[PDB]
């Protein structure tokens with residue numbers, strides 16, 4: 001799963 | 006803090 | 011309650027799903043529903059009940075400790091007094107914690123304990139009753155810390171008496187009970203010597219009975235024995 | 247709502263306490279109350295709002311993924327079909343997630359976005375609007391995955407247009423927006439090339455602007471740049 005902020 | 010179960 | 015229309019087997023299944031999803035509030039609600047069906051709980055089902063509420067109340071206790079700490083610090087000399095908010099919010103969390111404890115104690119009193127005929131079931135529930143009075147004791151101050159403490163003590167004591175009569179010293183329920191009652195003595199009853207004595211005697215009597223166990227039972231028992239040792243290391 | 251009787255400053259203070267206590271549901275409720283006072287939010291307050299709801303919805307998304315996985319596995323050949331419970335419980339969590347998203351989108355539409363005059367505030371809120379439509383998109387299937395996806399895209403695009411006009415390439419809001427819009431492209435819009443292109447251009451333009459920054463601004467910007475690099479590493 002990719003990083004988000 | 007001591008262990009409990 | 012809100013779970014009255016759901017099948018018992020469906021509630022248990024959903025409690026298991028909720029555990030996998032780390033949805034402990036849901037898990038607790040499902041298990042409350044299951045208990046309220048009025049049938050005795052199996053060992054697996056007792057474990058689901060205890061895991062659910064331990065996680066819910068564990069979160070509350072952790073939050074309460076953070077808030078109480080902040081509150082204590084805000085009430086000391088040489089910094090600043092900054093309004094009723096920290097007390098209000100600690101109180102809110104405290105009330106919610108008390109509510110969860112009362113719910114669990116309610117389930118045990120109506121009617122899990124009285125219907126629990128076997129040692130394994132009755133000791134498990136009395137241990138829980140001790141535990142949830144202990145959590146109430148942790149936050150108690152007023153006309154009632156003493157009566158709450160005694161309620162914890164009485165439940166643990168009855169559990170201990172049955173456990174010593176009916177279970178071998180390595181039984182994980184007997185071990186877990188003793189672990190927690192030992193913590194009760196240290197942290198709640200201001201009885202550190204009783205705490206240390208209980209942890210040590212429990213550990214030593216279990217050690218001497220390990221030879222009777224299978225590899226799997228050995229793993230289960232030694233896990234809890236290590237917790238006893240951890241506590242003794244903390245206290246001595 | 248339930249927070250109507252509490253002072254705005256008290257709600258903010260309690261949101262901060264709730265964060266320290268890891269009580270994100272409470273934190274979100276306090277910040278909802280604060281928004282509903284009808285005043286614009288400061289930067290710190292916007293951060294509290296976003297942290298609160300990100301944590302709440304994050305938990306829900308994690309639970310939904312566990313449940314959806316179990317549900318998918320239970321519907322395949324060569325094992326067993328075991329009743330409506332997994333679907334029911336996934337649906338329950340899904341509905342609760344949708345409710346949180348609708349709440350956040352409601353706050354943004356009434357009236358945070360329209361009252362946000364400055365680039366920093368307006369981009370932040372439009373990024374949030376994109377994010378919460380993205381979470382709705384993650385669980386959408388029916389007559390509406392497409393319209394939901396477009397709503398996410400439209401919000402992100404408006405945010406991007408403003409950010410490129412009004413903020414330097416190292417601005418953490420601009421960076422975070424681009425990071426998330428890039429994920430939108432990869433995971434939601436089936437546009438992996440657009441995702442990779444956006445992450446790379448954002449990274450490279452930020453790199454070239456780092457020389458203008460203080461040590462503290464540098465730390466903030468490079469943290470998010472590392473996330474862009476992490477994603478590119480995952481995708482290439």
Ligand SMILES: *CC(=O)NCC1CCN(C(=O)C2(Nc3ccc(Cl)cc3)CCCC2)CC1
Pocket residue numbers: 010052053054056057060130134137182183184185186187230233234
């Ligand atoms: C139905 C039943 O017999 N349950 C007890 C069972 C024993 C094994 N076990 C454990 O050792 C842990 N948890 C508990 C919980 C309560 C008690 Cl009284 C003892 C032990 C599992 C992780 C910590 C120890 C699970 C429950």
Ligand SMILES: *CC(=O)NCC1CCN(C(=O)C2(Nc3ccc(Cl)cc3)CCCC2)CC1
Pocket residue numbers: 005288289290292293296366370373418419420421422423466469470
């Ligand atoms: C009010 C305001 O300007 N908020 C942005 C601020 C920038 C620094 N920062 C971060 O870098 C993290 N979080 C976010 C959140 C949203 C956006 Cl758009 C960008 C960055 C903090 C940990 C991850 C990155 C906090 C928020």
Ligand SMILES: [Mg+2]
Pocket residue numbers: 017018
């Ligand atoms: Mg039935």
Ligand SMILES: [Mg+2]
Pocket residue numbers: 101104105
């Ligand atoms: Mg009180």
Ligand SMILES: [Mg+2]
Pocket residue numbers: none
């Ligand atoms: Mg004794």
Ligand SMILES: [Mg+2]
Pocket residue numbers: 253254
């Ligand atoms: Mg006011």
Ligand SMILES: [Mg+2]
Pocket residue numbers: 337340341
């Ligand atoms: Mg649905």
Ligand SMILES: [Mg+2]
Pocket residue numbers: none
């Ligand atoms: Mg473009």
